[PDB]
Amino acid sequence: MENDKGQLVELYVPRKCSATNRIIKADDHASVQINVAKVDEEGRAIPGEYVTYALSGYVRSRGESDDSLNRLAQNDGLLKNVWSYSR
Amino acid sequence: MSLPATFDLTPEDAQLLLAANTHLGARNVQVHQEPYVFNARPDGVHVINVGKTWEKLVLAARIIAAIPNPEDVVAISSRTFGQRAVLKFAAHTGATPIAGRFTPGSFTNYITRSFKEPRLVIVTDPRSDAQAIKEASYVNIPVIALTDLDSPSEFVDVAIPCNNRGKHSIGLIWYLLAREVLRLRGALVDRTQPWSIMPDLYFYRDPEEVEQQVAEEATTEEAGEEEAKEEVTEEQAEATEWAEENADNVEW
Amino acid sequence: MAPVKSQESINQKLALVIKSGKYTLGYKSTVKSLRQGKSKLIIIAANTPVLRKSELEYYAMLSKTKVYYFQGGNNELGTAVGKLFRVGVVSILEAGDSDILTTLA
Amino acid sequence: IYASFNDTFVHVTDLSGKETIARVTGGMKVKADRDESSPYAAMLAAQDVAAKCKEVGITAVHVKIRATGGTRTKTPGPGGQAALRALARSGLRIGRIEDVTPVPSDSTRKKGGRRGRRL
Amino acid sequence: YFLDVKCPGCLNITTVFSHAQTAVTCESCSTILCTPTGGKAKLSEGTSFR
Amino acid sequence: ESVIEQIVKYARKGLTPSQIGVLLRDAHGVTQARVITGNKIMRILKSNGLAPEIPEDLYYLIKKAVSVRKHLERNRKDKDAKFRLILIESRIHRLARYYRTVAVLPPNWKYESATASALVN
RNA sequence: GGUGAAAUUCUUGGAUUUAUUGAAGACUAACUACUGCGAAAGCAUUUGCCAAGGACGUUUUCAUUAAUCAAGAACGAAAGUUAGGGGAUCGAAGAUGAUCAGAUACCGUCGUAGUCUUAACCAUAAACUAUGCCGACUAGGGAUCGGGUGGUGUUUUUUUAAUGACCCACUCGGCACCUUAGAGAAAUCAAAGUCGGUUCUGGGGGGAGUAUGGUCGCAAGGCUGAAACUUAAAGGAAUUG
């Protein structure tokens, strides 16, 4: 409720922002492509697993896409209600 | 008429246009061949220069043309693309070949072979044939071959660089040797038929180009005779009784 | 991402400036020089108590000007000055140079 | 209403096989294993029991309550596993989906074959 | 190598080197020219070899 | 030859001591100064200039080693688990000895300083 | 529960299997690859902080500055050891069970120091690449990673424009395989080749990496290091049974 509130954070924009951070660090590795994953706190969860031919942009549309419907609605519930969120 | 682009005339040194078409370019390469290269392209190529081939062709030809005083030559091509044109080229010269699957031990058990040892041996693809060159080398016989990029030159003494497969290449390059042998004899006649491989009374595949008597030769070889055979499936039947009736009679 | 990372490079730039600098060393004379109004920069090397550190801040505030609070007792600033200076109170005056004041400003 | 709700689990050990016919709620409706009957060991390890234990399940499950649609969920391979699916069709249950989903993984570990017990 | 470069903004001619260590300031204005970078110092001037 | 080519490219003696001279007095950096300009001009300097008088240089090598040492010394004081890093401290301090044997032989004051100049500067 | 088969064990006082939630809790599956990096030992959650090191490219400095080294000194798995915290599965010893002639055995259950952490010792391993380390030359071939010289356009982005990957070469350093022929007993290697700089060190095998004395270590033991004597062999590789 309140336990879910903080944990699913703040808007759609901070789920996206964090997806951006990960790819750039993730180049640690080999150069080559593979795993990119976003996890989260009180549920939760892995919202999505992704594929790449990276750089900066590809992931922002790819975020936009993997954030499509099933994950979108959840983020929507975050922005809106599922129970209690963010401010 | 030929296809593009890529580029030196000159004149004529007879042959050019046919060789230019498909005949050159092949797969994987060696450094011992790499000076004798034109370049690399995309497309599953590696192009050997015609110009560089030209110099070689004369020198290998010189060796053959210079010897006509009794010499035997041995041709060999155990490989399927190569095979039948080597029978065709071999009957014309009267030199001994092995068109089929390579019998062994030819060169230092000389008894299976022709009476006297070959002064030289000509080979399509030395690498596939490599065993055959290896026996020859111990015998101390010159090994001459139409070797492509695919093989190290190290085992063969006079190398004619050019594509091992896709018979248009074997067909002209061998033709140009024969023509040159024919030159130092009498004047030049018009080109001998495109040759070539593939038997007919059957579906065919292999090449030849500019066209004529492919049909004539193939029918003539097939025409020739009832042989000790390995065959196909109609006279084999007729044979399995001939042997079963005999097997019973007891006959020794 | 970053600027360029760097801030410790002020020591290296401090160290050249000290080579033929006009500077003032120690609290009593840095204070005479500060009373003079002469100083452009003071670098305060140690975790001075509030009472001592704030008097300097007050003076800085009266002035224009900068004040670098290094504050670490390690006193690597002591490398420039002479190693002996375990605690460091420095005013910087005309070096015969001085892009340095501008750079940290 | 288009009937269906009954979650089915297939619980795997190489040694033996058991079903719990659980719910969404997590309560166990009924359970079934070998040793309700007479034979013990590999007479356990057999696929043949794995078939029977499921039927011993199902039959109660249906007729009395009468839940029909059921999600088949399996855990890693034992010998019993293939037989453990196959009767469920001929169960007169309509398997909604079949999910193998084994159990967990992922680092953890130690020498003691901790890992092996799970697929 | 030797490289003649011309400041696009300044319109002045300068002689800069290919693939330099440091930032290139124009003497025409103290605006950048070719940049240092993440390795392979490049440019943002045009012209040819001197 | 090598020196002559750059002589045609640059501009000329006297001017080249003055251009270089400024950057060095500001704060060391023999390599840096040298990448500025007008490289074609700077290119000549080893080829023609003896090499200038300068503070630092022989000292730089030692200075940097000590700079690095102190930072690592905290990491050796904290947690003991440091098995790889420790050798590095042993490599660097020691790379300073290794340079210190030949560098001592031409000048005076390198001998006194160089011994002392581990764990001070 | 467990295996060949079983039993020990667990078990009606309600287990186990099953659902969810917490604390603890060790490790990082999937990823991880003929793969990358550290002087080596080793090191793998992502992520942040301080700081090192080899790459290249520069031609800036010493302009050959260098290169190895007994003694000295540093690090040095694991397991032991010791103080103190934590202690889940695991798990010697050890406890019952089965085996079986015998099991203190493999096999199964149970179980403690240990595994782990911070503090401090040990100085050894099949510390291995069985190849000490530094340098010169001497064959190619497939691509792997890092960067650099790029050619070229495309994916890919955005449309001045430049790239993460890529089509397609070249160079530099490591890698390893595939694979040379003069050498290698050989099997093999491309150096273990062609003949280097330098150090340590070798002794026919068993007695023996042992005795005794020294040094070190809390101790375990490690370093250093053989004789009487005994034997006509030990050994390597390749073959044929």
What is the DSSP-derived secondary structure letter of residue D64?
Answer: I
Do residues E7 and E27 make contact, with C-beta atoms less than 8 angstroms apart?
no
Closest nt to residue B33, judged CA to C1': G140
**From the CA of C83, how many Å to the C1' of G194?**
59
Domain containing C26: what range? 9-105
The token pair at C16 is 């050249």
Q: Regarding the domain with residue range A1-87, which homologous superfamily does it belong to in the CATH classification?
A: Ribosomal protein S21 (3.30.1230.20)
Angle (nearest 5°) at CA D77 between D75 and D78: 110
Closest C-alpha to B232, from B197, B196, B199: B199
Closest C-alpha to D84, from D18, D14, D5: D18
**From the CA of F53, how many Å to the C1' of G176?**
50
Listed by start position, the domains of chain F span: 1-51, 52-121
* Residues in Cβ contact with A76 at an 8 Å cutoff, skipping those fewer than 6 apart: none
Touching chains, B (3+ CB pairs < 8 A): none
CA of F87, closest CA in chain E: separation in Å? 30
Chains F and E touch (3+ CB pairs under 8 A): yes
The token pair at B248 is 């019973």
**What does R_g of chain A's alpha carbons equal in angstroms?**
14
Domain containing B110: what range? 11-201
Which CATH number does the domain housing residue E32 bear?
2.20.25.100
Q: Residue F74: helix, strand or coil by DSSP?
A: helix
Residues of E in contact with F32 (CB under 8 A): 21-22
Provide φ and ψ at D32, rounded to 5°.
Answer: -155, 150
The token pair at C69 is 């609070």
What is the DSSP-derived secondary structure letter of residue A28?
Answer: S
Q: How far is residue E28 from each of residues D88, E14, F38, measured CA to CA in Å?
A: 86, 8, 13
* Residues in Cβ contact with B62 at an 8 Å cutoff, skipping those fewer than 6 apart: none
* Residues in Cβ contact with B220 at an 8 Å cutoff, skipping those fewer than 6 apart: none
Closest nt to residue A43, judged CA to C1': G21
* Residues in Cβ contact with E13 at an 8 Å cutoff, skipping those fewer than 6 apart: E4, E5, E6, E7, E47
Return d(Cα D91, Cα D68) in angstroms, integer: 9
CB contact under 8 A, F27 and C79: no
Which of E15, E20, E50 is facing F35, going by the closest CB pair?
Answer: E20
Domain count, chain C: 1
Method underlying the structure: cryo-EM
Full 3-state SS string of chain C:
CCCCCCHHHHHHHHHHHHHCCEEEECHHHHHHHHHHCCCCEEEECCCCCHHHHHHHHHHHHHCCCCCEECCCCCCCCHHHHCCCCCCCEEEEECCCCCCHHHHHC
Exposed, middle or buried, B197 (CB in 10 Å: 0-12/13-18/19+)? buried
**From the CA of F88, how many Å to the C1' of G174?**
21
Nearest residue: Cα versus C1' of G139: B31
Closest C-alpha to D52, from D70, D76, D77, D33: D33
CB contact under 8 A, C16 and F28: yes
Do residues B49 and B38 make contact, with C-beta atoms less than 8 angstroms apart?
yes
Using the Cβ of C10 and the Cβ atoms of chain F, whether some distance falls under 8 Å is answered with: no
**From the CA of F45, how many Å to the C1' of G149?**
26
Domain containing E49: what range? 1-50
Is residue E39 left, alpha or beta, with left meaning phi > 0 and alpha meaning psi from -120 to 50?
left
Which CATH number does the domain housing residue C63 bear?
3.30.1330.30
Closest C-alpha to B191, from B205, B178, B206: B178
CA of C12, closest CA in chain F: separation in Å? 8
Using the Cβ of C103 and the Cβ atoms of chain F, whether some distance falls under 8 Å is answered with: no
Do residues A64 and A37 make contact, with C-beta atoms less than 8 angstroms apart?
no
CA of F37, closest CA in chain E: separation in Å? 7
Residues of E in contact with F29 (CB under 8 A): none
Closest C-alpha to B212, from B200, B230, B194: B194
**From the CA of B64, how many Å to the C1' of G232?**
68
Pairing outcome for strands B120-123 and C89-93: unpaired
CB contact under 8 A, E21 and F40: no
How many of the other CB atoms lie within 10 Å of CB of B52?
A: 14
* Residues in Cβ contact with B40 at an 8 Å cutoff, skipping those fewer than 6 apart: B46, B47
B37, part of any domain: yes
CA of F61, closest CA in chain C: separation in Å? 14
Q: How far is residue D64 from each of residues B243, D22, D57, D61, measured CA to CA in Å?
A: 79, 16, 12, 6
Bases of chain G with protein Cβ within 7 A = 1-7, 17-20, 26-33, 35, 38-42, 46-48, 50-53, 55-63, 65-67, 74-77, 88-91, 117-120, 139-142, 145-150, 156-158, 162-165, 167-169
CB contact under 8 A, C19 and F55: yes
CB contact under 8 A, F26 and C15: no
Amino acid at F49: G
CB contact under 8 A, E22 and F40: no
- Helix ranges (DSSP H) in A1-55: 2-7, 13-26
Which of F31, F32, F40 is facing E17, going by the closest CB pair?
Answer: F40
Distance separating the N- and C-terminal Cα atoms of chain C: 23
Q: How far is residue B225 from each of residues B83, B231, E37, measured CA to CA in Å?
A: 20, 12, 81
Minimum Cα–Cα distance from E36: chain F residue:
F35
Q: Residue F83: helix, strand or coil by DSSP?
A: coil
Ordered domains of chain D (ranges, CATH): 1-119 (3.30.420.80)
C3, part of any domain: no
Residues of F in contact with C15 (CB under 8 A): 27
CA B230 to chain centre: 23
CA A23 to chain centre: 12
Amino acid at A56: S
CATH of domain F52-121: 1.10.287.10
Orientation of helix B50-66 relative to helix B168-183, angle to 10°: 40
The token pair at C99 is 């892009």
CA D83 to chain centre: 10
Return d(Cα B43, Cα A70) in angstroms, integer: 45
C38, part of any domain: yes
Minimum Cα–Cα distance from F42: chain E residue:
E17
The token pair at C40 is 């452009």
Alpha carbons within 13 angstroms on the beta-carbon side of residue B140 total 0
Full 3-state SS string of chain B:
CCCCCCCCCCCCCCCCHHHHHCCCCCCCCCCCCCCCCCECCCCCCCECCHHHHHHHHHHHHHHHHHCCCCCCEEEECCCCCCHHHHHHHHHHHCCEEECCCCCCCCCCCCCCCCCCCCCEEEECCCCCCHHHHHHHHHHCCCEEEEECCCCCHHHCCEEEECCCCCCHHHHHHHHHHHHHHHHCCCCCCCCCCCCCCCCCCCCCCCCCCCCCCHHHHHHHHHHCCCCCCCCCCCHHHHHHHHHHHHHHHCCC
Provide φ and ψ at C48, rounded to 5°.
Answer: -60, 145
